[PDB]
Amino acid sequence: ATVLLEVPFSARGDRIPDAVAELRTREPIRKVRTITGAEAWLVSSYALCTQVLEDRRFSMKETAAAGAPRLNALTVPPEVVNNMGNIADAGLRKAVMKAITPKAPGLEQFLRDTANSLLDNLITEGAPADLRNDFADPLATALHCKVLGIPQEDGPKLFRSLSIAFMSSADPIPAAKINWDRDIEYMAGILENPNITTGLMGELSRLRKDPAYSHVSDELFATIGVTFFGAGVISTGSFLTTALISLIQRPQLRNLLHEKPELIPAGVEELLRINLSFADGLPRLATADIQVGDVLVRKGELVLVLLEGANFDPEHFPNPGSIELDRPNPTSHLAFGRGQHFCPGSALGRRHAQIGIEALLKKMPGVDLAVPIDQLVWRTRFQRRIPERLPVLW
Ligand code: HEM
Numbered sequence: 001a002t003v004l005l006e007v008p009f010s011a012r013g014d015r016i017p018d019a020v021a022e023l024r025t026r027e028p029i030r031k032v033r034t035i036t037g038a039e040a041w042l043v044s045s046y047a048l049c050t051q052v053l054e055d056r057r058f059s060m061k062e063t064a065a066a067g068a069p070r071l072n073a074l075t076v077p078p079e080v081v082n083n084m085g086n087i088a089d090a091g092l093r094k095a096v097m098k099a100i101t102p103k104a105p106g107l108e109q110f111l112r113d114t115a116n117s118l119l120d121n122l123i124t125e126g127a128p129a130d131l132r133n134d135f136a137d138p139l140a141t142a143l144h145c146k147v148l149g150i151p152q153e154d155g156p157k158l159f160r161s162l163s164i165a166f167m168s169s170a171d172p173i174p175a176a177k178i179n180w181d182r183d184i185e186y187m188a189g190i191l192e193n194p195n196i197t198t199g200l201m202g203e204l205s206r207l208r209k210d211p212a213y214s215h216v217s218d219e220l221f222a223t224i225g226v227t228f229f230g231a232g233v234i235s236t237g238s239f240l241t242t243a244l245i246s247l248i249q250r251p252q253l254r255n256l257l258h259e260k261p262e263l264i265p266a267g268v269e270e271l272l273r274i275n276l277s278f279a280d281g282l283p284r285l286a287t288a289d290i291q292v293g294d295v296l297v298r299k300g301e302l303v304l305v306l307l308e309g310a311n312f313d314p315e316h317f318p319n320p321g322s323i324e325l326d327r328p329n330p331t332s333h334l335a336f337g338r339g340q341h342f343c344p345g346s347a348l349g350r351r352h353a354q355i356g357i358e359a360l361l362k363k364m365p366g367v368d369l370a371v372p373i374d375q376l377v378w379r380t381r382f383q384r385r386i387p388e389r390l391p392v393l394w
């Protein structure tokens, strides 16, 4: 006898396990056990992943209900799981989205200048360099301080909460509450700080004093700062890191992009498609009995949408493991989700990766791993897949 198949299958972000294509072909929705001991339905084909993400009866908000089957323990208060819904209910969706676009004057030049300064510091120090801790994560942190309007020097202490805040744990995490409460106090101070007049926190601080928002709560204003810093920094730093691995392991493509940087946006869209940064399927709770493939999912059951199941589906992306810059459907991957909860930071995340890669290819055209790939240490029990260090030479 064996126990029911457990998820996740592997914390490695440099290879997709053979189980995924096997499930997708044989059982594109099938029952699994999560780290809490709950059962769930794992969806692994592009068709069924899009069906679930486009049907709001598979609810994000209801995953926070007491008693529900859980993917992992909450690391924020339950009402924060409905963060974007709360932002939309407060009439703040358009304002938040405007503040986090990469189109703000000078923002791209600030990202380029920051990437070039970090790279020059590594070149001065000499190989090996760690492109996660001393390049992709400080570039994500500096970008998000600039986008929020908060001091660059406050980035590193907010960042250090993230290796706990974005854990994927079977049990509640006492340090996540200590850091959450501290980071909320900091964002509440930022709203009262007269020096903060730009970016998303300067805009929320002005709307807070406008009569059209006088009953929006101070807890929501501070929550938007902590959640958008943390989601944006963990997601862009982790995606850039694992995209640099995929590029370093494809020297022919790396040389193509170095030679013709105008192809970097199409290369980044393929590195999104093949990215294994999300460590778990996206969770949803059924609010009705709904047929998905050969399974009748029942109200109250947990469904997990495996993004790499969709993104490596050869029925939708033929030769799925290959980066091909001339696909006819290049932005139809699920790396930013789909439907009601599609990522609000998608443009910013694409621009962070494009500028980081352009800068790295110009400054370190011979970049390569400095250790054998199997020596990278993959973080476990985390909502992203990331190597703890990414040692390179050039
Ligand atoms: C390459 C970088 C990024 C990737 C791959 C990414 C991926 C995703 C995915 C897959 C979702 C959907 C989750 C779901 O449906 O359950 C999502 C939602 C979210 N993302 Fe991103 N993200 C990125 C960058 C950003 C940035 C830069 C921000 C903010 C500055 C951001 C903030 C959020 C928020 C707040 C949500 C929740 C939306 C909702 O619930 O409606 N992300 N992201």
Ligand SMILES: O=C(O)c1coc2c1C(=O)CCC2
Pocket: 075, 076, 080, 081, 083, 165, 166, 226, 227, 228, 230, 231
């Ligand atoms: O912002 C966090 O610290 C956070 C860390 O983990 C999550 C969040 C969310 O706000 C969304 C639910 C998952």
